Amino acid sequence: GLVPRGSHMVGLIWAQATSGVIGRGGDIPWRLPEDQAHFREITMGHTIVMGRRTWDSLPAKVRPLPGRRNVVLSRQADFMASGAEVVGSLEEALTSPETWVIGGGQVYALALPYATRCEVTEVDIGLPREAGDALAPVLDETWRGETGEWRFSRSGLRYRLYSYHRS
Ligand SMILES: NC(=O)c1ccc[n+]([C@@H]2O[C@H](COP(=O)([O-])OP(=O)(O)OC[C@H]3O[C@@H](n4cnc5c(N)ncnc54)[C@H](OP(=O)(O)O)[C@@H]3O)[C@@H](O)[C@H]2O)c1
Ligand SMILES: CCc1nc(N)nc(N)c1OCCCOc1ccccc1CCC(=O)NS(C)(=O)=O
């Protein structure tokens, strides 16, 4: 369903291991080129919001991510994010009619209360939670959605898509 242009739809999009781990050591601890396609179709043409550490983690060749207004949250007023804009709190990050929050653990948690969509890729990889991991936010009982079927990636890694929504 289309978003009325006077409203403010906030979505979260992430990929996680079964354990909920999304990030470790400044990176994502798997590679899934198929997940990149889904990420692009959801976010293309909209504003994307990310934490400063997620900006740092982006491959240099796609930083800023093309075809999307890139917004970076930082408390560092002098932060350099070429091709993007830096905001110092959530207030001015969510003023577009459609915004996708693209990570990381801190900024998913910050934006979750305002979100009405989550697009979640689950990767069937056994990565037990460790000290310092970035984690998927916990979804409360207001959320509902659909669980997709497992598929193998070319590499043999298994993954499936969840699409969640709430009012
Ligand atoms: N699997 C996935 O789908 C996925 C997607 C994205 C990222 N990741 C991974 O997630 C990890 C990064 O997550 P993370 O939790 O460490 O960091 P993050 O959420 O990306 O960034 C945290 C930074 O955001 C800024 N920030 C946080 N809250 C703020 C607020 N209220 N106001 C202003 N600025 C705020 C601060 O920047 P300053 O320190 O500059 O003040 C903070 O250090 C990486 O491993 C990355 O690869 C995974
Ligand atoms: C695909 C990962 C991902 N996956 C999901 N599902 N949600 C996220 N937030 C999400 O994170 C998006 C931000 C981090 O992006 C990374 C991380 C590691 C390696 C590469 C990229 C960039 C991928 C890329 O080129 N994207 S594109 C084609 O130009 O639009």
- Phi and psi at 143, nearest 5°, equal -80, 145
* DSSP assignments along 75-139, one per residue: S-TT---TTSEEESSSGGGS-SSEEEE---HHHHHHHGGG-SEEEEEEE-------TT-EEPPPP
Tokens at residue 120, please?
Answer: 């979640």
Q: How far is the CA of 57 from the centre of ligand 1 (A)?
A: 9
Query: Could you say which ligand is closest to the alpha carbon of residue 35?
Result: 2
3-state secondary structure at position 146? strand
Q: How far is the CA of 105 from the centre of ligand 1 (A)?
A: 6
Query: 32 a known binding residue?
Result: no
Closest ligand 1 atom to Cα of 24: 45
Q: How far apart are CA 103 and CA 110, in angstroms?
A: 10
Residue 83 annotated as binding site: no
For residue 137, what are its two tokens? 């936010």
51 touches 72 (CB < 8 A):
yes
Give burial (CB, 10 Å; 0-12/13-18/19+) of 166: middle
Compute the distance between CA of residue 108 and CA of residue 59 in angstroms, rounded to an integer.
20
Whether ligand 1 lies within 6 angstroms of the CB of 47 is answered as no
Residue 107 tokens read as 């900024």
Q: What is each CA distance from 82 to 19, 62, 78, in whole angstroms?
A: 34, 11, 12
Q: What's the reported resolution, in angstroms, to a tenth? A: 1.5
Q: How was this structure determined?
A: X-ray
